[PDB]
């Protein structure tokens, strides 16, 4: 038999935990402030209505009706099974470098258990002789900036991607703890994974409330809030503002990454997933908007402290969280209670997203091979051990150069291409009319005209607009003032093409393996596996023009 969620609340907290991560904190408020302030919410809320929710609703109903993972859900259109293998490999690529970012948060949490924070003075063994006591965002000779690039990263001992060196033993030990925690929270299925999210999915909300209450009291906090929610309606006349909201919506919801389809496969058949699609989509977007109030309270406080403008302090991820917040924290009364709670919140943010991505591989692959389904504990050991071994490249002395390469090419054009092909198969080849008949089979109500129009015309067109734009607006690899060698770009494109080439390859294998006439091998690959008996009866739905004209 197939296991199910112990309680309904377990499923809701798993989806919310995977959807909310560091991207909702260290990226979104900066984009809103830079683009249009309060006018950036118009294209942001528009793409959620027409593209964010239709894809979220589509994926949740796909797993519940079929009760299969990402790879093997394509029994409805056997020619598209290569798309499932593309999202599984992409989910493996992200794990090779996302657990390193979590290791940084654990390294900062272990250094906060003292009465003298390491990032306050310029008298340690990791300090350059030019360290100076405190565009403030570009200065690299401050105590907080010298503890990140010379105390944790050890970047000053590397000359580029041509010579990275041996892994750091301090960072290696922190990576070991993360993988062990990940294994024991995933080795028993969803009976154990459904209880871990009771703490990790709710802890950041508790800390964010306390940080917000104290944040608005600090001097200069009002200036940061006022500049955060300004209105500039003339910024909507530029095409870059609309593209910025289009990429943020697709990458912050995580719809089509193979995680939501696995979660919904353990749901009950009669569960109402139309309600779940709207509720969990809105919590993710509301969390991003609320988090900007707490962040810009600190930014306004920092600008008042240094007697500079708010435009000289604003930063983005990995420069605001690890270089900027520790500097402001070191002056807030206790300065130790605040340090502990801040880095505890980061751990709770990232742990849920790593669990969700790894389950998309175990559930997807165990549903393809039956032998793997019978050994869950041993198979979970293989996935985590491979992640730990292949993540040793990102904890070396030149580890940020490798992490930058993987971040650009593992996702992006490859993941945008796979989701575009998945929507085409379900909406057009499988049939929108058939899809709505399956939803009415479980819930008892047909979706409607608005939802059917967004699945067949609007969502495929929105995805195609982001795929083309991503290719056109591509630049060679760089990091700060370091320019990557030309060969490093060819290796980057090889990683991206590895997932994409899988889709055409499976079509050739499926065609060349099945027997029959030329027009017979084509019919088997487009007919659902449970409706193969009518192929020989010379009545194929997809071979009539009436099928393709459905709206």
């Amino acid at each position: 038999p197939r296991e199910t969620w112990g309680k309904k609340i377990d499923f809701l907290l798993s989806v919310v935990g995977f959807a909310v991560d560091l991207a909702n904190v260290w990226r979104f408020p900066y984009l809103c402030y830079k683009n249009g302030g309060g006018a950036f919410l118009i294209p942001y809320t528009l793409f959620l209505i027409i593209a964010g929710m239709p894809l979220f609703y589509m994926e949740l109903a796909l797993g519940q009706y079929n009760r299969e993972g990402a790879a093997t859900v394509w029994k409805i259109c056997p020619f598209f099974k290569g798309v499932g293998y593309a999202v599984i490999l992409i989910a493996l690529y992200v794990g090779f470098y996302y657990n390193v970012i979590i290791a940084w948060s654990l390294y900062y949490l272990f250094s906060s258990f003292t009465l003298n924070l390491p990032w306050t003075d310029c008298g340690h063994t990791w300090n350059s002789p030019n360290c100076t006591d405190p565009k403030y965002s570009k200065y690299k000779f401050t105590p907080a900036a010298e503890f990140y690039e010379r105390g944790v990263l050890h970047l000053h001992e590397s000359s580029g991607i041509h010579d990275i060196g041996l892994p750091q033993w301090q960072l290696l030990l922190c990576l070991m703890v993360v993988v062990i925690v990940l294994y024991f929270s995933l080795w028993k299925g969803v009976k154990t994974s459904g209880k871990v999210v009771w703490i990790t999915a709710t802890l950041p909300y508790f800390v964010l409330f306390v940080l917000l209450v104290h944040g608005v009291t600090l001097p200069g906090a009002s200036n940061g809030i006022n500049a955060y929610l300004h209105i500039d309606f003339y910024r909507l006349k530029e095409a870059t503002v609309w593209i910025d909201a289009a990429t943020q919506i697709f990458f912050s919801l995580g719809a089509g990454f193979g995680v939501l389809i696995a979660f919904a496969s353990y749901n009950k058949f009669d569960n109402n997933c139309y309600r779940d699609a709207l509720l969990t989509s809105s919590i993710n977007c509301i969390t991003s908007f609320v988090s900007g109030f707490a962040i810009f309270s600190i930014l306004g406080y920092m600008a008042h402290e240094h007697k500079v403008n708010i435009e000289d302090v604003a930063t983005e991820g990995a420069g605001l969280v690890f270089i900027l917040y520790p500097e402001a924290i070191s002056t807030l009364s206790g300065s130790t209670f605040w340090a502990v709670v801040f880095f505890v919140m980061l751990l709770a943010l990232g742990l849920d997203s790593s669990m969700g991505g790894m389950e998309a591989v175990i559930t997807g692959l165990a549903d393809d091979f039956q032998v793997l389904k019978r050994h869950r504990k041993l198979f979970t050991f293989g996935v985590t051990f491979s992640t730990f071994l292949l993540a040793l490249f990102c904890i070396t002395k030149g580890g940020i150069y490798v992490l930058t390469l993987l971040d650009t090419f593992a996702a992006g054009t490859s993941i945008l291409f796979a989701v575009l092909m998945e929507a085409i198969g379900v909406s057009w080849f499988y049939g929108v009319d058939r899809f709505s008949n399956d939803i009415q089979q479980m819930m008892g109500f047909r979706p409607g005209l608005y939802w059917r129009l967004c699945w067949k015309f609007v969502s495929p067109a929105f995805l195609l607009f982001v795929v083309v734009v991503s290719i056109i607006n591509f630049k060679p690899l760089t990091y700060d003032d370091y320019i990557f060698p030309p060969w490093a770009n060819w290796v980057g494109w090889g990683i991206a093409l590895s997932s994409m080439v899988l889709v055409p390859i499976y079509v050739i294998y499926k065609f060349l393996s099945t027997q029959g006439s030329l027009w017979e091998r084509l019919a088997y690959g487009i007919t659902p596996e449970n409706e193969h008996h009518l192929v020989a009866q010379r009545d194929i739905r997809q071979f009539q023009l009436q099928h393709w004209l459905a709206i």
Binding site: K34, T240, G317, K475, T478
Partner: peptide
């Protein structure tokens, strides 16, 4: 934004 290239989880000055 212009002059800042963002990928999935991190942004770099391009």
């Amino acid at each position: 934004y212009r002059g800042l290239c963002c990928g999935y989880k991190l942004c770099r000055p391009c």
